[PDB]
Symmetry: T
Subunit: 147 residues, 12 copies
């Protein structure tokens, strides 16, 4: 249809809260989505979400966003951040600026996770603050679009 913000979630994040809950909390992707949908609605901003484990699905969704009139994308590419040049060219290709978000501190883990094909082109980046990182990106986008 049309939606001012677009939240994207990369591969594996559908698994939030589905293992032994005693391992990574009880907070699910749908919990996160509800929260972002509420927040956006309280500001009278249209918002839309997408998640997939398939890179070209995400790439298609980004192309579709250009036609739907999206102004900002909030993206947690999960593992795609270290590997996907197509993802970066898609974002650049459509010239929709974006904020990169990670639930975990990516700098605290393996060394290959320090490198990102997206960070240098983001407005900015939030890693390690869990769910609230998405909320903060939204907070920031709402202030850029409708002061």
């Amino acid at each position: 249809m049309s939606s001012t913000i677009l939240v994207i979630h990369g591969p594996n994040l559908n698994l939030l809260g589905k293992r032994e809950p005693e391992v990574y909390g009880h907070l699910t992707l749908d919990n996160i989505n509800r929260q972002l949908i509420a927040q956006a609605e309280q500001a009278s901003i249209t918002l839309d979400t997408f998640q997939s484990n398939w890179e070209g699905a995400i790439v298609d969704r980004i192309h579709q966003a250009q036609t739907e009139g999206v102004k900002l994308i909030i993206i947690n590419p999960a593992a795609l951040t270290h590997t996907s040049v197509a993802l970066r060219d898609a974002l650049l290709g459509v010239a929709i600026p974006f904020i990169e978000v990670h639930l975990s501190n990516v700098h605290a883990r393996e060394a290959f996770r320090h490198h990102s094909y997206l960070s240098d082109k983001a407005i900015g980046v939030i890693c390690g603050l869990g769910a609230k990182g998405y909320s903060f990106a939204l907070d920031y986008a709402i202030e850029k679009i409708q002061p």
Copy 2:
């Protein structure tokens, strides 16, 4: 007790080209071999192949809901490139064994790095199709002594 064999991209091509230069062994040959071996020891064994990274990730996820207890995976070229495959296998926490037909260490330098090997139980490479069989032998004996 279910085991899942995941074959990665391009493995469906086994045998097609020229059987004389490259062997006559197909992807189904290998599957029939392991299905037989797993019936012999009364294990439920399931198998999967795809050229699409996303299909494989959706397959590892389904494996958690199905109560799989070990994955024997030959990720082919995805061994060198996919963090998404690692984070699936770790996310669902089914232990795995990495297998390759050919000796990856004897080829281009870039084939010497893996995003999977460090998190497998173990790795067999360069022993042809019997390497899958050895993985399943390890798996049968780990799962039901």
Copy 3:
């Protein structure tokens, strides 16, 4: 004899995002011209674009089945990252020419490395849509001298 021309991810945006930013030609324009050129030399020419690696890998496997003699391929981003794509081209043993509209060596440091270039016949970067025509020119003269 068939030549297949393959466009990698994002090349479907050609033209659409900012006429000002890049060459007015669109992906369909490029494909029209190419077909016409190969009709003018009596050669069957199929085309294909996808944003999904596995879709491209599948297309290459089919190309073997269809008896395609040469692949002209612009992998776009996948040149820097896809070993799957490499092993599909190598596996079916169809020769290929790599094309890019822009000069990759002028862009960021990571775009200087390829998983395809070293196994291509040659490469053409930075000469815009004519890169495709030159590749095709070269392919016609290889097949029917």
Copy 4:
């Protein structure tokens, strides 16, 4: 203090040169906003800035004595250079959030390496002054039930 905010070297220069170059917003404005944001949640917040590494390390030792529960630190250039600052934070074991006005990844490559980011709870870069608010929003959620 419950929250201490620390600003590294050259942050005092915000807004000073050419008020039509990088905005009018000063360090004192930023501080003003954070003290009031924390007044609104009945949290006591202090702030500190210096161009001298040693003064910052002293300030962090004093935070331990003052009973500070969390530190919000934009270490500026010292992110890339100062192991002493990392060891001041580990030694007093006060958790911290790292904050950067600009996007250090968009800047030249020596600025992609940090000595603090791995030991932080999290990091916020490139959202300008609102980065500090977000840090403070998180810290308040974490400290009061």
Copy 5:
């Protein structure tokens, strides 16, 4: 409007030794072809070859006085070593297309880096003589739309 085609060191040997090694094609054959194509568009086309970096640098300075609009260069070995040549081409500010007969990415690692590729309009490698004629083609359209 004049195009200048420069040929680097050792290219004078083309087709001179065991014409079953790198073919029967000579340097002078490449030039007949290019002059044919340039005359056919009524464009003046001059050619040059030497094994001496200086003769090439001087030749590029002369091109500036002669009103050369575009240069087609196969630097050969100099592509990997000559900053002097990069600086001449830049000093005179005449746009250039880099051309190599063979696939430079298929040979040793030291041949993958170039002191010119990043400042060229674009690059052609791997397609023999035709790579030159493709560059000329593009040059003629650039000068005479």
Copy 6:
């Protein structure tokens, strides 16, 4: 037809410190399993262990003058350090299969590199002692179908 099994330095300590560290299983147990498995298939089998690189290199030269058809080797630490061992194996042209009890990819970075893996038929790390068995089972089929 003889197979020689070769264990490198430190493997003589298997199950020699606190039976709760790496099982009850000793180096002798492994050899026994392996000589038994080889009696079953009428293959004669020789074993050898040493902490001394030169003793192992003499053992490999010895294998040549005894007509040993294949070598199963766990070079332990020497996999990362000894080009003398590589050149021993290459020098006598006896095929080998490299085996490790642990997953060497799951350890320190320096254990990723190897002076043997690229010249072996293939490699098995991480499957415990069953690794040696599996290499034997492969060795037996190649030597007598």
Copy 7:
């Protein structure tokens, strides 16, 4: 017009260790010479030395408020380590010349890298005290045509 000369850490020791190691050329001598030189063109010249990175950064910040037209700086050690100094010079936007008594390229490898040189107008190294003079001469020229 003010010109600021800054001398970094350890430059206070010039001439103090051994009546020969690099002359009796002391810091006061150098400063006096520079003060004389600037007088003769009615330039106000400030000097400043410290062993504390943060005092040097303060001093450059104070330059902006003094309307300083150009800085002549010898950061000693701090060239190779201080990102704060770089961001100070850039934040205030006063152009500077980098000066070094010794030839930093003649010594250990770690002295070849500088966090300043790329942002300086230019650099003089290896020419002893006179480099400060040359830098001044240049500064006088650039400020008063």
Copy 8:
């Protein structure tokens, strides 16, 4: 005084936060022990700690004027970052012994590198408080044979 002990940043924390994790030993305890050992030898021993790199350089220069014969220095984090500290010790030409409480090699890779180690007499890491005593012991024998 004859001997100077310099303690770098954060060493004032020794035995504060968590008595149990790093034990009950303080920096005052270490200085008490060392002063008393120097008293048995009739050698004068001064001590110094600071969080500020400039204080530490200033105290080294000040050591030259006091006729200090040898310096036992524990730079803590500054060992990996500070060339100004190197150049201070080299400038005053007072030989020195680097001491560290913890095993610096057992920790993150960045801690293995140092700007002082190659210019010390020797280095003691990992042996706790006794490390300073051993260096003082050695230093006493260098001045009292």
Copy 9:
């Protein structure tokens, strides 16, 4: 043997190599001094030297069974090359201290690396023969408070 002191290759040469440039103290002299210090603390001490890697490994295994509580080792050249030496010390689980006569950081860059440093309690280098005394001294305190 409560303490075992091991010396690696080439250390047997201390002394006779022209004892006026590098002079006098021999390996036997260091052992006398060591054995005397241990008698004086009523603790038993064995010593070992060899130029054969395998023999030093063999001794470290014999130290497990002899009940040695702590190893003091100067591997000399083996510290840079031998991961078998590392794995044997880990195998037997005997805590150790690494000693070098000379400052290893003051020489060639290859000598900066060690396969033992990070698993030693501590390291002492550059302080000549007294570095073994210091190590012994420390060990005596650890085994007998």
Copy 10:
């Protein structure tokens, strides 16, 4: 002659195209200024420029037979590639100062390395033509105090 100024490749372009782009200052004007400055102090000064590396090496050899005491060399691009030129200046043992008109450190990364700088007395880069004047001033001063 007493002093020799050597200009490398491309420097003959100065002020020839779009003189405003980089200044109405020709190599000829620089030489004129230099010759007069030398004449002021009764020093004879020969000048030289080439684009041919061999011409420059012959000339440096000729300087030895002519008794040249010091060379001032702007090697331009040859600073990054030519070890022959390094070896020419060393073989004849004439000290030299390196000059560049632009800040080479501000450019592409491959210009950070030089085969001359470490053996020059010093280096001046970024100061335009005045760099050569400063070199000469220094040279004149050292040759006749």
Copy 11:
């Protein structure tokens, strides 16, 4: 010519500067000795020296037209830089032995790389002038057993 000796840049200096310090031997003497040695074997030997890369490359082309059977070359500094020299030698396909008067492995790091060594028959370095005689001895033995 049957054999051709080639001397690269700067070798013409041999024995021309303070011969009692840098040694008496000239290039003419080396040539005189190889021409006599060749005379004894009834082999014709020519010799060439130049400081110009392109002169050397031209001479290697001519060698082909003269039917030279083996080249002995001391490329001197060009060994580290000239890809054009390697492609000349490979392009005419005349086998060659690389010689160096001095041990290049004893010099700076960058004298470790060579663009020719790996395509030579072999290499002799550091045996002075006799290096050339041994190359000639080997060469006479190869052309006529």
Copy 12:
């Protein structure tokens, strides 16, 4: 006595596997030639070969006490791994020439690095068994000019 020829590991296999691979030339053939050649000049020549790093180190220590003036050594695989062997040669301070039968530079990348070449008088590789003769020839004129 006086001259000693050392062969490293695996050279005992010369000639022995398949007389039509690398020739019929044995380690004895080599030694005999060298012994005759040295008899002809009134020098006694020793020879020694081992597959054990320590036998070689011992042999070198022995050579010190037998008044050996020069070593000719082919360390074979040990050139790339043994610091111990380097430290022996330097320890006893007997000059040495490094020899290899094959062009070590034409093989794998790891074989370019050596822990010996930089300390040898010179090095000869790729000239077969004559390399030894050439090294002896040189050695004789060094000992008996």
